[PDB]
C-alpha cells in the first residue's frame, strides 16, 4: 500500500494566522501532472468532510511525495482532525490525522464538585464528581484527596474536544468508592493543577454537612 505520514500530530494556531499541515507519501501520487491527493476535515462526532481534491481558506500544495494543506486565515470552527488521502492506487489509504487546535488566551477552569446522590448511596455506591470546565490550554492534572491523603484507585477521567465556539476544553473526573468506604471519611477534595495559577484550584465538601 501507499503509506501516508502526516506531520505534526497536533498544532496550535492563533485566529487569523496560517496553519500548515504536512503529508508525505511513501511513493509518488502524481501522474500526468495530476496529484491524486485529497484532504478531509473531521469535526468530533461528525463524518469526515472533503476539503480539497488534487492541487478559499483551505489550499493544497505539493507534488510527487510531498504535500501540505494550508489554512488561512484560521477561524474558531477550524478545530478538527485533518486527514490526507491518496487515490493514486488501490487500496485507497489515509494519513494518521493532524489535530488543529485554536490558540486562545489562557482561561482558568471553573471547578465544581458534587457528592454522591442519595439515589446512588441507596444502591450501595458512592461516586464523587468534579467538573473542570472551559479552560485553556488543554494540559491539566486532577488530584483526588480524601481526608487530606491522595486517592488514586477508583478515579476515571473524561475530556471534551476543543470547543468550536470559545476554543476551551473541559474535563470530568469521577472518584468512585463504595458507600461503606465513603461513609468512613469526611473531607473529599478535587484538586486541579493548571498553567493559569501557581496554586492548585481546590474544591471540596465535607460529607457531614
Amino acid at each position: 500500500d501507499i503509506v501516508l505520514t502526516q506531520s505534526p500530530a497536533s498544532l496550535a494556531v492563533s485566529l487569523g494566522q496560517r496553519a500548515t499541515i504536512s503529508c508525505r507519501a511513501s511513493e509518488s501520487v502524481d501522474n500526468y501532472g495530476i496529484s491524486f491527493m485529497n484532504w478531509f476535515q473531521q469535526k468530533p462526532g461528525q463524518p469526515p468532510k472533503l476539503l480539497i481534491s488534487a492541487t478559499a481558506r483551505f489550499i493544497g500544495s505539493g507534488s510527487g511525495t510531498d504535500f501540505s494543506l494550508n489554512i488561512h486565515p484560521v477561524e474558531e470552527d477550524d478545530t478538527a482532525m485533518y486527514f490526507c488521502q491518496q487515490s493514486k492506487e488501490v487500496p485507497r489509504t489515509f494519513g494518521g490525522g493532524t489535530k488543529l487546535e485554536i490558540k486562545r488566551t489562557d482561561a482558568a477552569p471553573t471547578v465544581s464538585i458534587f457528592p454522591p446522590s442519595s439515589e446512588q448511596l441507596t444502591s450501595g455506591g458512592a461516586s464523587v464528581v468534579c467538573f473542570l470546565n472551559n479552560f485553556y490550554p488543554k494540559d491539566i492534572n486532577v488530584k483526588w484527596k480524601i481526608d487530606g491523603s491522595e486517592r488514586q484507585n477508583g478515579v476515571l477521567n473524561s475530556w471534551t474536544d476543543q470547543d468550536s465556539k470559545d476554543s476551551t476544553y473541559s474535563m470530568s473526573s469521577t472518584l468512585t468508592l463504595t458507600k461503606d468506604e465513603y461513609e468512613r471519611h469526611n473531607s473529599y477534595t478535587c484538586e486541579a493543577t493548571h498553567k493559569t495559577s501557581t496554586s492548585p484550584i481546590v474544591k471540596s465538601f465535607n460529607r457531614n454537612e
Binding site: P47, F94, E119, N133, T160, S172
Partner: protein, 218 residues
C-alpha cells in the same frame, strides 16, 4: 440535497456477521459508486472497498480477508455491507461515502453517511442508572451522572433540549463491561432552583428513558 442515511448502531456477538445499510437520496443512486470506510478511533480511517451501484463490481481492501461483502438494492437506492466473523477488532464506526470527481480523474469521497457504530462484544445489554448532581445553597453548575449501562449510545439532554448552551456532555468511559458518562450544565444562579432543571437520558438499546429533576439539597 445529497444525503446518505445509514442504519443504526449495532451490538453483535463475536463470530456472527452484521449487515449495515446506506440509503442515498437527492441524486441518482446508480450514477455513483459507494465507498465504505472503517474508523476504529479518532486517528484511523481505513478504506474497506468501493462498490459500483450500477454494475455490481467491487474492489476490496485485501486487509479485510474477504470478510466484507458489498451488495445493492437499486430499487430502494440502498447499498449494503456485510462484515462476517466479527471480533473486537471490528468494533468501529463504519461510513459509506459517495464516489465522485471534483477534479477530473481523481477519486474522491464527497458526501458521507453519518456512520454506523458497531460494538462486537459478549457483554449484556444493561440500562443506565441516572444520578442527579445538585450543589448546595453568578452561574451555577448542575450535573447528571449516567452510570452502569451497556452498550453505547446514550443521549443526554437538559430540559428536553431547551437548555443547549452551557452544556458539556463528556465521552463515556468503559470499565468492567459497563459505561459511565457525565454531563454538566451551567445556568444563571437566578434560574435554579427558582426554576426547574431536568436531566433527560435515553438508552435505546435497553429501550429506557429516564428524566431526573436536579433537586436542591434539603
Amino acid at each position: 440535497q445529497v444525503q446518505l442515511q445509514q442504519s443504526g448502531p449495532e451490538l453483535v456477538r463475536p463470530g456472527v456477521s452484521v449487515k449495515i445499510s446506506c440509503k442515498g437520496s437527492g441524486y441518482t443512486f446508480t450514477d455513483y459508486a459507494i465507498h465504505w470506510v472503517k474508523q476504529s478511533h479518532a486517528k484511523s480511517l481505513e478504506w474497506i472497498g468501493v462498490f459500483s451501484t450500477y454494475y455490481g463490481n467491487t474492489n476490496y481492501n485485501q486487509k479485510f480477508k474477504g470478510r466484507a461483502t458489498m451488495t445493492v438494492d437499486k430499487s430502494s437506492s440502498t447499498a449494503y455491507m456485510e462484515l462476517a466473523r466479527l471480533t473486537s477488532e471490528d468494533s468501529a464506526i463504519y461510513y459509506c461515502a459517495r464516489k465522485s470527481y471534483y477534479v477530473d480523474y481523481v477519486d474522491a469521497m464527497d458526501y458521507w453517511g453519518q456512520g454506523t457504530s458497531v460494538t462486537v462484544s459478549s457483554a449484556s445489554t444493561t440500562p443506565p442508572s441516572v444520578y442527579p448532581l445538585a450543589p448546595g445553597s453568578s452561574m451555577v453548575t448542575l450535573g447528571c451522572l449516567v452510570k452502569g449501562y451497556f452498550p453505547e449510545p446514550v443521549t443526554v439532554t437538559w430540559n428536553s433540549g431547551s437548555l443547549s448552551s452551557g452544556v458539556h456532555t463528556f465521552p463515556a468511559v468503559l470499565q468492567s463491561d459497563l459505561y459511565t458518562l457525565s454531563s454538566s450544565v451551567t445556568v444563571p444562579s437566578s434560574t435554579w432552583p427558582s426554576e426547574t432543571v431536568t436531566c433527560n437520558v435515553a438508552h435505546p438499546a435497553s429501550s429506557t428513558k429516564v428524566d431526573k429533576k436536579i433537586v436542591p439539597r434539603d
